Every structure is written in C-alpha cells, then in structure tokens.
Design a protein around this ligand. Sequence first.
Ligand code: FAD
Ligand code: FAD
Ligand code: 1PB
Ligand code: 1PB
Lengths: 494, 499
Amino acid sequence: NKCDVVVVGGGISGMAAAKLLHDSGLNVVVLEARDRVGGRTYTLRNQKVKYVDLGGSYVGPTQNRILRLAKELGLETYKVNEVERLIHHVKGKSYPFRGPFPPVWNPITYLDHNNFWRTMDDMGREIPSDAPWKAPLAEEWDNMTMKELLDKLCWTESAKQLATLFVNLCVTAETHEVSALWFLWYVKQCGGTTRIISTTNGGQERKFVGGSGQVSERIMDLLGDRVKLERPVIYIDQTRENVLVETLNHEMYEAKYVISAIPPTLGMKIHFNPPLPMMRNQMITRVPLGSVIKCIVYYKEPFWRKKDYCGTMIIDGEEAPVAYTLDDTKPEGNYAAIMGFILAHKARKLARLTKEERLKKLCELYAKVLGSLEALEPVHYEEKNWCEEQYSGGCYTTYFPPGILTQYGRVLRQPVDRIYFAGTETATHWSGYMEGAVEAGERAAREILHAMGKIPEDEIWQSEPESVDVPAQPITTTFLERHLPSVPGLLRLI
Amino acid sequence: NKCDVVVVGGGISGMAAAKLLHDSGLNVVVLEARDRVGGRTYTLRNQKVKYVDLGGSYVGPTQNRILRLAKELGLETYKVNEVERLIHHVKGKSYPFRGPFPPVWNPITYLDHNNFWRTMDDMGREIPSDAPWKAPLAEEWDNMTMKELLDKLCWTESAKQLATLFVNLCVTAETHEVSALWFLWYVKQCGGTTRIISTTNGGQERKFVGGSGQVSERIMDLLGDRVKLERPVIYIDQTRENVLVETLNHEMYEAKYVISAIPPTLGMKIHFNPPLPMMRNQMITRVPLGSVIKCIVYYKEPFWRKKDYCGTMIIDGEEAPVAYTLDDTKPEGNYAAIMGFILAHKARKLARLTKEERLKKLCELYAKVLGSLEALEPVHYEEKNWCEEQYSGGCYTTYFPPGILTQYGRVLRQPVDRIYFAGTETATHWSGYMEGAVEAGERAAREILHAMGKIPEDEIWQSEPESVDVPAQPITTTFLERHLPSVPGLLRLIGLTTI
Ligand SMILES: *Cc1cc2c(cc1C)nc1c(=O)[nH]c(=O)nc-1n2C[C@H](O)[C@H](O)[C@H](O)COP(=O)(O)OP(=O)(O)OC[C@H]1O[C@@H](n2cnc3c(N)ncnc32)[C@H](O)[C@@H]1O
Ligand SMILES: *Cc1cc2c(cc1C)nc1c(=O)[nH]c(=O)nc-1n2C[C@H](O)[C@H](O)[C@H](O)COP(=O)(O)OP(=O)(O)OC[C@H]1O[C@@H](n2cnc3c(N)ncnc32)[C@H](O)[C@@H]1O
Ligand SMILES: C(=C\c1ccccc1)/CCc1ccccc1
Ligand SMILES: C(=C\c1ccccc1)/CCc1ccccc1
C-alpha cells in the first residue's frame, strides 16, 4: 500500500531514480511488469556463452553517469576489440581500413562523403539539446524525413548508401520513417557523428564484465523487498489527496508522487483518472520504437584476428541480413563471438524465418565478408528479436516521425500533476542509451525532491564529473575537412 | 461471466457486430469503456440546440450499409443545405461559386488544378481497396509524405494551397505527417476525389434527423442488459480453452470469441496473454489518429441564405482558425447554425484558448468571409476537442505515417487466435466513416460465424443493395478534363515545337 514514491518500471532509469530517492531517506516502491529487472538490457547466462548482453551493452567516454553508477555497484568495463582492421563491405567486396570512417578514393565521392558528415554536425550546432523544437529552422527540418534530407545533400550514391546505413544503425528505423530534425538532434545530443559511430573514443568503446544486466540486478539487491516483479501498472488515479496506483493482479499502491520510467508510448497501457492533458494523450500514440534483432554467433576461436581483422564489419546492400558487427569475444580471449544487428525493415522481413535459418544466412555472409570458411562452423548461437516485447515495444529507443517533435516534443518530460517522467527518452545527453536512462531517472527523482522542499530548484539538473577510468579525448577536425567544398560548391567554383 | 462472443467497444462498429450476432442466435456482451455508447459519434441534446452531432455526422450516396442499418432502426435523413452559393476564401477575399470544385481563371493554374485532382484518381486506380500494399509502386509511394507528392505534382502555389487544405480536411493531419500511399488509398476507397469532397452527390449530402448517436443508442435498446457501460477492458487471456476478458472494475467475462472494435492504437490499453504476435505488437504503436475540434455557432436566422450563400466556406490561410464550414440549420429552418472544423496543427494551437476566445475568433472570421456583421451576434455555441478523448485518441480516424502501411498494413484485420478485428479502420469501403464501421463490424461478426461452421467462407464479405432513399449518381469527367495537359506536359509541347 503506502509509500512516498511509486516508480513505474524497473529498467536502469527506474532503478536509478529509486536508488537516489531511497538514499535520500524516502520510502520507495518499484512496480515492474516482467519477472525480471533490466528492461531493454538483458544478460543471458548459460554454460555455452557464460554471459551475453541480448539488449543494451556498450558504454564509452562522455557517458559519465552510467560509468559512475556501475562503478559504485562494483562493476568493471573492458575494451571492445578494435586492435586490427575494420572491414567495409560494398558491392560484394571487402575493403579493410583503419579509423572511425570508411575511406573513399574517388575525389568527387570524397568531397560528397566529407560534406555529408560535416553538414550533419553543422546542422546539429543550431539544435539545443534540451529543446530541439527551438532550433531556428525547427519546422522546416521537422516536416522533412531523413530520406528527403539525404536526397538533397548526397550527390553520390556511395555517400547516400553509407548515410542510409548510418541512420538505420543509429536509430533502428528507415530514413523515410524519421524526422530530419529529430535525427539531427539525436546525433548532436550524443556529441556528434564521430562520437556516436566510434568504438575507440566513442559510444562502442566498452562493455561491462559480466553484462549490463548487473546494473539493474544489483540495485534491486540494494532495495530488497521494495521491488515488485510481475506487477504491470494498469491504472493511475490522481483525483484524491494521495495518488493511487493499481497493478494487473489487483494490488493497490498509495503515494505522494509517481515516476513513470517506461517508454513514452507504453504509457498507453495505463488508464488515467483524470484523463491525461490533451497533448500528452495524443503524443503517446505518435512515438514508436525501432526494430532490431541482436544476434551473436559463437566460434572455437576469434579466427578473424589471424587475418588482421578486428571483427568490425560495415556491410552495405539489401541482400545482407546484418549491416554491422562487432567482436563479442570475452576480454580473456575465449567464447569467441561475432555480434551483429538485423535492422529496421530487415528485422520485420527475416523474423518469419526459423532461428536455424537466420544462423545459416549470418554464417554465409560472414564467410563472404571475412573471406573465411571458418565462419561456416559456428559452435553456438543466441539472438533476441526486440520487436516482440510487449513491455518494450522495440529497440533501441523511440523515434519521432515527421511533424511530431515540434508539435508534441515539449510535453515529453512535463509533469502531469504528481506524475514525473523518467526513461532514457526524456534525457538531454545520450538519450536512447543506458547513460540517458541514468540522467533521466536521477533528474526525475530530484524534481520530486524539489517539490517536497528538500532541495533548491538549482539542484534538479546536476553535472557529472568525468570518469577517471574512461577519459574522453576531444573530437578534432583537420583543416581540409573543414574547408573542402561540397559537390555543388565545387560546381559553383567552376 | 459466460457468453458466445465478447465485443470490446460500443461504437457503431461494435454495436453493428453485436446486433448481427444477436440476430443470429448467439449470446453476446458488449463491453464499453465510457458511460455512453456511440464512441466517435455523440449527439448532445439541450434546449438551446435541440440536438447536435459533436462527432461523426454526415452520410451520403454509396454509403449503403449505414443507411440500411439506420433505416431498420427507424431513422430518417435530411439534405445538408447546398441550394445557394459556396464560398472560396483565398488571400483575404471571398469568391462565390457553384459545383463541387472551386473554379480557377488563370489558364496555367487551371491546368495545374485539373492535373492534381486527375492524378490523385489516376494513382488511386492502381491501389487495391482490400490490399493497398499490393500497389505496383507501393513502397515508392509509401516512403514519401503527401507533402513531397504535392511539391512534385503542383506547379502553382494556388493548386498546392488547395491540395494541402484538401489533405488537412480529409484526414485531420498535415501533409508532412501522412504517407502518400495511405492517403491515395484513403481517397480511392471512398470512391475518388469528387465523391469524397462533395455535398450534393457525395459524402456530406445528408445527416440523420435527431443525430447520428441514435444509431448506437437504439441498438443498445435492442440488446438490453447485454451492453455494459463503464467497463474498460484491461486484459485478454487466451491461454485456456475459453477466452477470458477482464475489465477495470475487476469483472470477468468468458467467451469463445472476441471482437476488438476499438481504434487500432487503443489496443495498447489492453494487456495480452499470451503476448501479441510481433507485427501487431509494433503496429499498434505506429498508428495515431488525427486532430480536430468541431465547433458549432448558432444564430437567430440563417442570414447567409439572404445573400445567396449556402453556408459552405472553403477558407485558405494560416490565419484562419477554421478551414471548412457547412450550414448546420435544422431541416425545419430553425436553430440556424454554422458548423466548422479546426484542423490538425490549428487544433493543437487553438486548444490553449478558452471556449469564449475560440467563439470570438470564429465569428470574426465568418463576418469577413460572409461579408456580414450579423455573424458577430451568436446566440449560442457548442464545441468538442476530440484530441482530449482517452477512449478515442483523436478524430476522425487513424492515419498512417510514411513507411507503415507497407510494413504493417496486412496485420490490421488479421485474427489473433480467437480475437477478430472490427472498427472503421479495418473496412475496405469508406474506412474512417460510419459506413466503414458498419462494414467492419458485420464482417468481423461473420468471420466468427464461419469459424463456428454456421456459414460458408463465401459469405464473410457481403455486398450491399443500393439505398432507394439515397441514390448514387455516377462520377463523370469531361473530354477536356481527361485530355488537357499538365503544366510540365504543356512545357514539353513547347520544347517539341521549338525544334
Ligand atoms: C534493445 C536494445 C537496446 C540497446 C542496445 C541494443 C538493443 C538490442 N544497444 C545499446 C548500447 O549498446 N548501449 C546503450 O547504452 N544502450 C543501447 N540500448 C538501449 C538501452 O538498452 C536503453 O536506452 C535503456 O536500457 C533504456 O532504459 P529505461 O530504463 O529508460 O527503459 P527500459 O529499459 O525499457 O525500462 C522500462 C521498464 O518498465 C517496464 N514496464 C513497461 N510497462 C510497464 C507497466 N505498465 N508497468 C510496470 N512496468 C512496466 C519494462 O518491463 C521495463 O523493465
Ligand atoms: C470525431 C469525428 C468523427 C467523424 C466526423 C467528425 C468528428 C469530429 N465526421 C464524420 C462524418 O461526418 N461522417 C462519418 O461517417 N464519420 C465521420 N467521423 C468518423 C466516425 O465518427 C467514425 O468513423 C466512427 O464513429 C467510428 O466507429 P467505430 O465503432 O469503428 O469506432 P469508435 O466510434 O471509436 O468506437 C469505439 C468504442 O470503443 C470504446 N473503447 C475504447 N477503448 C476501450 C476499451 N479498452 N474497453 C472497452 N471499450 C473501449 C470507446 O469508448 C468507443 O465507444
Ligand atoms: C555507427 C557506425 C558507423 C561507422 C561508419 C559508417 C556508418 C556507421 C555505430 C552506431 C551504433 C552502433 C551500435 C549501437 C548504437 C549505435
Ligand atoms: C472536402 C471538401 C473540399 C472541396 C474542395 C476543395 C477542398 C476540399 C470535404 C471533405 C470532408 C468534409 C467533412 C468530413 C470529412 C471529409
């Protein structure tokens, strides 16, 4: 029954909020729909894999909140393998390379590629992290899909192909499905293109030893009986003095404040009394999550390393089921594995096949890309289709279709009476990531602390000290990168 | 507890399904979330208005299912007033006209306007009503917004402006919000541009005497205690032999089959066991409803008629709160009124104002458009913002953003075990309308009858005899309308001569 705060959702965001409030002296309850915590993170353990992240996994520099929370819980990171060469596979052929960006030799194509990445960041600089709808050209950019933007910007098919893959991989959605404004905000709020795409010195630098699921599990250990599993919330009543929260099994919870720490659209699963304000009522029908299958193929050995390949493959083309891979071998060098993503429309298309059929296609692809018959001999396979999850709705995160961010965006974290809003979608830095989940949960918790008169308004938004374990190198450009003309710019010079 | 079929939702679709099943001998229960039936139709009665439709209202020729159902329930229609001139208001000036389409005098603009409407119908002919994702260019058209299509097709601002208003009015959404494929399907499945936009001989020809809400109310009367009000469904369990359906107040209902007769996205309000198939699970998060406020301003007299205006206004421009009106006077000539829609982004924008502030802006607009000070003297005002409805989600209906119809479209009315799907969104003819609600409800009901071995597969989809009361005149084109070139077509005819 009674407590100070009910938190709806036991993912990283809900757990972080609950930890903060509990450490501040309040009585908190976490209501979780599944028989487990973690949400969009899930670590599977069995003898064949030891442990594997089937959901959220990667952390890197500038993600200081998730790193500090994990460190406090007694967790360690290790570096994703990027010692050897990356592979760009394009039109049925593999081109090994070094550095974050796949290189280009044709001069016209070079200019086009250079201008695309640069323009993404140029446009991002006009978009406020905490208020993307306040961009000077917000409406113009929001009334346009990323497909339209790419059609105008890319003068070569080569740049357009890579840009499309870039969009598919970042947000598990097609270019024609997403707002240009929203996608430009999304990249900007992760620190730009270099930071978002990079393993070394970027978002995919590291994973947690033992899996990311330990973050939520260990916070549950700290909270003891305060976490209630298999308690899907169905009903929130705010008509009386105290907020009443009902779960599917008929249990009642009474609190002064609620934190909603679920994906925005999953708010639809709750019946509200009184009805939600009009803008939120419509917003939560307008914000889907992307489509992805995460697949891990295991091998006797990390054989790609012998050929001077790190395990990273960037794979172009409709025929390829997987567009991107990383080495998923344990830091000890055992349980050799390749992690790959099946993205967007391919996730919908290939879901019809059996587990075995998907494994076959992946192995045959990897054999082609790595130029190795050894890829045809998997020892084990694990996979997760996130599209099928009732209490996630997809992965990695929520995308905004054209028109929505300007019309409904300011409503996302606006409190509804005594309901405050967490969840990675409401963060201002690395929204969509585990880092954003921590930012949003702790911020929502502090909003309630302020409403209780426990802290000054000053302290709702708090900066984070840089991790000593994962220091950030700054993102640099060269003189030529900054000043080389676009394709149309070169044509004007002619 | 126990019955043959549980119907979720007591709108026109749910009520039509329940009536059919009940008339066939089965024991049916209707579970309705609100304290009333009707859903997106709602008739308000008070002394000032007598009665008024605050939601769905208009019916017309080719809508034979809603007309037959209403007639069986003892209802009558009357004709919306279109005796006098329509008004097209553009750039702060009114131009009176007759006929369905606002006329154009500039020859270049004429070609552009003619080609736009023609192309909409041309493209529609390639789109199967029952399977829009099967169109030859389905993917190309679906990966494009209506805004992109309009930018390529309209060579004049005048055509683009009117086309934009056309999209806003048909589907209560912005051109940049909606898939081109989906919108083209939507128009086609209503019988084309002429049929969808027309009062006389089209969708807006008639209303029901006493209001459309009587349709659902009278079916409830026929069903008696079988309709359960204030029973929002929260949980559907299909793991056991019989389907278990739970409501918010903890009541349990057990049935052989369920009809879901709610807007697709509102399926999100229900927790499923076992979980929904993956494609439906994602589909119901991808399909929002549009935004609209329906507003009715009352006057002492239908004064616009004296100036030879019927009361129809097509109003262009960002500054205008209302883009479309119709005369809403009773057939007796009393309770003189103007009905207007506040559409899409304007519904969101002007919702912040008070009721009084909205009334003021409408009167001042009407005064300008009708050139009449009398418009500044309203005697009464009613309005409904459908965006604020938890158990509707918006109005009139569900739109599909770019990319969705081809990826998830075939899932819309695909049964999930013993759950079958009604609701106007699943219809193949006048989806989005009361007609589509009747088609979908009765078809879903017959799907269950077939599964029970009561009828042949042959009989699931049934044609409807034409109404004798509301006959349909065919849609005709002229020779010039068919063969006049587009703007780019004329330019090609010029480039050819210059050689
Ligand atoms: C799925 C995915 C995500 C992902 C990723 C790869 C995949 C396949 N890669 C990542 C990466 O490597 N690095 C990274 O930082 N993140 C990446 N992600 C995304 C990341 O996992 C998410 O951003 C993050 O986990 C989101 O956390 P958040 O706490 O904000 O949201 P959640 O995990 O979805 O938690 C919500 C919980 O609420 C429960 N729920 C839902 N509805 C109810 C109701 N009605 N009542 C009670 N509880 C409810 C859910 O069950 C869930 O536990
Ligand atoms: C809103 C609107 C609609 C409209 C219109 C103008 C406005 C402002 N103009 C129309 C026009 O003049 N001509 C016409 O034919 N229709 C036009 N419309 C659209 C029309 O009203 C709709 O197409 C039609 O009414 C839809 O009927 P349907 O039966 O398919 O759907 P519904 O009316 O929304 O009914 C759904 C019912 O289900 C209940 N509900 C929702 N969730 C639950 C749960 N979880 N449990 C139990 N019941 C639930 C709703 O309360 C509703 O009653
Ligand atoms: C993008 C890599 C890239 C590099 C070059 C060209 C195109 C793409 C990584 C983005 C990512 C990876 C994994 C989870 C989230 C985001
Ligand atoms: C469109 C009229 C029109 C006529 C000419 C130009 C542009 C628009 C009517 C559509 C409509 C009206 C009422 C509810 C549903 C649909």
